[model samples]
Target: EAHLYMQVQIVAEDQFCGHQGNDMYDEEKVKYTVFKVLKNSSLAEFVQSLSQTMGFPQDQIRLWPMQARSNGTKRPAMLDNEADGNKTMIELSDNENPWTIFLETVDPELAASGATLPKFDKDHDVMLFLKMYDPKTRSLNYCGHIYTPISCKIRDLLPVMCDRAGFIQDTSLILYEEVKPNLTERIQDYDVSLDKALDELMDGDIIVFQKDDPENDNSELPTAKEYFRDLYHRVDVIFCDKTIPNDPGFVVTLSNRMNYFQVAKTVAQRLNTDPMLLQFFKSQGYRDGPGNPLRHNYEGTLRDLLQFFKPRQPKKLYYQQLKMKITDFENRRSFKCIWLNSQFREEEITLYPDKHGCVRDLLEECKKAVELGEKASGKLRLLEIVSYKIIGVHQEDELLECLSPATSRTFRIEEIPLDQVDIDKENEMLVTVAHFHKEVFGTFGIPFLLRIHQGEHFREVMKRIQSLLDIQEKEFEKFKFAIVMMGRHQYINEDEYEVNLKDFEPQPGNMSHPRPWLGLDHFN
Candidate 1:
């Protein structure tokens, strides 16, 4: 059998320093080097082999799931060889197979989407999601938005990839936005030393464009607007996060040239927090405690952190005060807020602040107002009784958001009193809760059960939700109709189910099982 080989085209930016020579129309503006890979080798193997020469770690190189193609009939690049489940290899036997490589993060759904792979266009710019790691926080940080010409060199396009540790790259290969990709206009590289271009020239500088004169003795021509050069690459440090409230949480933007520690200090200053304890998390406005509970390691560059959290929706980074201590002077005296009573719902009235006087009085007034609002709006709080392990969440609203998007009814989570629940009553309590979720949210989610155990971690639950909702990249509406299965676990252990119910069954026509114990987790 002959060893199969395929031609690999590496696509990257021109220069890492954002410098382009005086000739903008230079033919070598795009940096690309074609190589060959063997059919038997895994994509990981090829990356590792190339890393030795490229001086990049294998883990830092991730292939875009969608490959480059010129025509509709062109085959998409394959990362995982279908022939074997044990290896991730692209078949090289196909004579027409020519692979294009770009550094990026690949989402499961987006990779599976059958959208046409975009062809390389010199007129258009490629939008990349760049990320870097911060060792101080042990978290990946979002760097900035990088727009590079198609013909640029990998090193030039993402200079941070060379300077920073653990860099990640992804292009806007998947279309989540309706807008078409923007194109670059004709322009020349700016003269950095002279700063002669209109856009490039500093304030208080003058440059005039004169008509070309062959007979005139004046040989000097001032650098004018046309002389102003467009950068081969553009990077925007400031980007918006829609996840935050109307006034979205501000981002900490910095130059890629800065070191990790410097960037951390800059971010901390912007967030008004201690530089030493500056930790970053994915979701914003969910930190209920004094510090972040979901802080992840900042390992690469700030850009890496942003791309790490970029999924389903745009994520924002929120600062948590780590060193701030509660002082007696700042502490004010207060009282039990207030409480409302009802069989079908719970309400509260404010009595502490106004009645007690001082800060307590203010609290009571606020409580009273909230109670009044709930009553006016006819807000009913349904008790969501999880039968198995009741996992307390940081915010109750997040649970609601994860369950369903319809907000016609509100829910108040209450642990099911296992002792009070009767196993004989057709699981009436569970049925009632399911009915309420259906009627209010129009979802036929799983029923509730009250078993006693430590609920799975919140991260695991969210992972399960993401898997359920991510049917396809374009199928975003699936999240709006997300149904919260009571206790979905990613994997199950067969050894845990040691008991055989059949062995305990009655010999005759008798009810051996106490109740209709529906299967849970994978056993179901």
Candidate 2:
């Protein structure tokens, strides 16, 4: 058989870093050091190679698999069996995504520390309930019971808490005392005795860990109590401006308790504009110009904005410096286009056509803004990204001002060939598709697109998605559909046919990605 090589990432588990479990499994960091190995190789095969590479004995090298989960994509676990070396990488990793393995040296001292749940004298030591908060899921799951001496410093207990919770102890672990209900506060001193760290500790009162290893920065880590408080109240927001398109956009955690004007007043300071004229819009496609007319209005509290533009959290809004309150041109319409060319970034063009304006006029403006320079603007063929389908626009024949009111206000200008499409015939709604499995790769990826329009029976819309999946006929009943947005799930009614696509905001407008997604997942 031809030798096969499989792609993988190996993170050395040296004691110097002190991180274990979840911290070891970062997708970004894993992607940083991807390696390839011979297919069907046993653990010992790579162990000897890695041991030689690290100056450790092959007998002392052990491999641990980094399991991927909805939240703990960056964590690893040991395969504690003599047969561990007998298993192939193909069978060793998670069957779905078996690509990453964490390698650790097996010293007696390291092995003891690597072990979970060590015994303690219940009479003299302490017994505490250990619960961990998953910030992404907003669930406080029971880790296990931890036993330690009452006089034992929390620094000694921190490793046990992390080991029980499948977390890393290397990072600055923030501790929290859960007094139950809503009474919770940070245990500021880890070096203090367990009883001193938490003044009043009962068996029922849990010791909490928010293990998304935070830095020394002031950003607060979420615990069980913090989760409920931050649910709809704490909003991570940013105001993106057209002027600096490259700015990744800074974020601020604002309170939804504030009204729209109060929130705008705070954002205005960073935008460097008067709070009076501050307004935000569903970002029009930014190509080169940030000066696109503030076409649509987003009003209400920071919470509403959080729920509206729903990229989950750290929500974004685009602001403009307008002197007048209602300085919008009633006669003109804002049509945004992104040139799907290597020649990319952002550039918005304006047109004032007196019956003479054509597609080329906007193309001319788009070309100048994102300076194509010596590069060819090519044929300047205009294309409509209708429901993500690339439909051709009559570059010269179509009048720029006469686009159908029901049609999309967006265009993808590219030099590639496109089949001609009728403006009036094309439907006016956009939707996307996602699977439950996507949450596994998420905070890392976006689901692809699907086709839909206003008032399609929610069931009828799913038919295309079903076709896209090409699943077994019986799977039609084994699945359910939902519109999960703003970190919440809304199950669709099978009986309700009319799916108001208009109810969804234009997908936080991007160069290509547009429209919210409909998730079709397992019924159970």
Candidate 3:
């Protein structure tokens, strides 16, 4: 076996805000330190060593592997390998070197899926659901989230948190050996320079501290609530223009000196638009003062624009205008004219009441499918509905009369003209009674030998029938009745065949027994 030296980065999960679990750390004064283990170790052993080093109970430490994108591919961890292998090793110099691992308490929901890692990005910071592991309960509690950086150092973040709260250079600090301390005393005190304080931190450690509240009675360890505010310097931007209609724009990180025109130009360049055409407006809000109910016009530097509107609780810009492709069964498919206000959200539009009732409408709608160009002509038609024992036709005046509801007995075919019976009404009537064909006969009448102009696929026809019956494909296949052919029948040799047809007789056994001549004129 070859000796392996793995270099892995460890990130704390509870360092950032937006956590909802009971076991997570959410203090603003806390700083999480990053760790790098240079030696190859099993995942379990790595967790154990990390637990002891961070002063967390061995059962309380949970680990999830973060995968970075390599050559345009970012992948999840080897979940299948997690269960079967304990002595898994990786080489630092190999293709899979420099791994980012997330440190949190265990999550039972996460572990139930076989300790699988959630989706994450490779080149930037990402949020991972923080889970706190508890050995006493043998459970992983859902904690807050953790922010994992792509390649940032632990020392780089210590000053950011301190600067966020506007602390001076002389605030004293208390250091604890444990990841979280419960009424424990600090071992040392340090000034705001954080040089000595940074040295006391461990890899993947979260440091929680709060600003000193001087007005509180318990000044040494203030019982006062830590009042903190979130400072946002970035906004999600959406672009709208004649050329680029539907787009969720990039995040515009605000700076103290950047102006609205400059921000709009930046967005324009990103969208490859003429910068002169770019204009910026805050999304829908009351204009000017509180009394002005119309939209607001925000101007000046990005800093001024955001700061002045902060108290009113205005949302980040979520406006975008985009082209939508729509279709109607009655007409040709084409893009709609004019600009429409659009949102990057889902809105449900019910196309049909249900999938069942649309078959005929669709079938009728498809009549013009072949009529797109002059090359194809004529609409589709419904000519017949057939079964093993009975066949309904478009010419249903006599055929329907012969059908009996109570018994297998069929009456004599005596009725009026085939065309005068209203085929459309008869077709609908037949379909209504088609389901109960065996028990109800042709009281309502249906089409058999249905004449359709264009031939459709057999599977498609079956699908239509299945939709009509509100049945599955297998059950549709099991139906004793099925459609045979469509369109009206034409006699090829009508001139000679009509002259010879007068002497035509039913072949042996072709007629109802003992009534051989009945077959000749009976059909007409």
Q: Of 1 and 2, which scores higher on TM-score?
A: 2
Q: TM per model?
A: 0.19, 0.36, 0.20
Tell me the spans in candidate 2 whose CA falls farther than 4 Å from its real position: 1-3, 13-25, 29-34, 70-74, 94-98, 106-259, 284-316, 324-524
- Writing each residue's lDDT as its tens digit, candidate 3 over 430-515 gives 22112333322322322122211122243443344444335344444334432111211222221232222122223554545221
Q: Sort by TM-score, best first: what order? A: 2, 3, 1
Model 3 worst lDDT window (10 residues): 515-524
Choose 1 or 3, whichever is better by TM-score. 3
Question: lDDT per residue, candidate 2, 1-524, as tens digits?
Answer: 43466666666533213211222222434332355776778766776777787666555555556564443223344364355776777766645333766654555565666643244344456556566666655565656454467888878777777776676656456677655334567777777887777765433345667764443123353455556455436557666764566667778777777776676678777667776565565443323223333333344555454453445444566665665443233234466556655433334454433334576666666666554425453556565645444444655667866665555545666553221222223454445455564342232112335556667776766676665555588877866667765556677787777477555554546335344456666632
Among these predicted structures, which one has the highest TM-score?
A: 2
Model 1 segments beyond 4 Å from truth?
Answer: 1-30, 35-251, 255-316, 319-335, 339-524
The residue-by-residue lDDT of candidate 1 on 108-207, one tens digit each, is: 3554574322333323444443333222222223333333443444434333433332323432111111011122122233222122222322111111
Error of 1 at 143 (Å): 27
For each of the candidates, the C-alpha root-mean-square deviation to the true structure, in angstroms, is 31.3, 30.5, 25.7
Worst 10 residues of 2 by lDDT: 16-25
Q: CA lDDT of 361 in candidate 3?
A: 42
Error of 1 at 100 (Å): 13
Q: Candidate 3 at residue 477, lDDT?
A: 37
